């Protein structure tokens, strides 16, 4: 995993490009990803 | 007197403007049809078309 880098990211088959920030939003444990306005993945859960 | 009338309308139009939220109507207005065009336009990126 790579974070502050521009990166090409496939987490669980999202297939985006973006830089990845630590974030500290608190997700709950059922839920996985979270989205934007545009319904645009904005935050993802690592699945390992 | 003309001067003390002149002082106390810009008091009031402060008081006026800080009192009612839709003073600034047509501006807010401006800012809000902008924002939902962009918001629209947006949200469309999330229709299947």
């Known amino acids: ?48 | 007197l003309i001067a003390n009338q002149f002082n106390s309308a810009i008091g009031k139009i402060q008081d006026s403007l800080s009192s009612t939220p839709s003073a600034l109507g047509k501006l807010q207005d401006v800012v809000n049809q902008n924002a939902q065009a962009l918001n629209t336009l947006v949200k469309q990126l999330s229709s299947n078309f």
Do not use: M
């Open chain 1, 1 to 48: 995993l790579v974070k502050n880098k521009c990166v090409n990211f496939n987490f669980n088959g999202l297939t985006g490009t973006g830089v990845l920030t630590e974030s500290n939003k608190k997700f709950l444990p059922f839920q996985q990803f979270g989205r934007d306005i545009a319904d645009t993945t904005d935050a993802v859960r690592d699945p390992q």
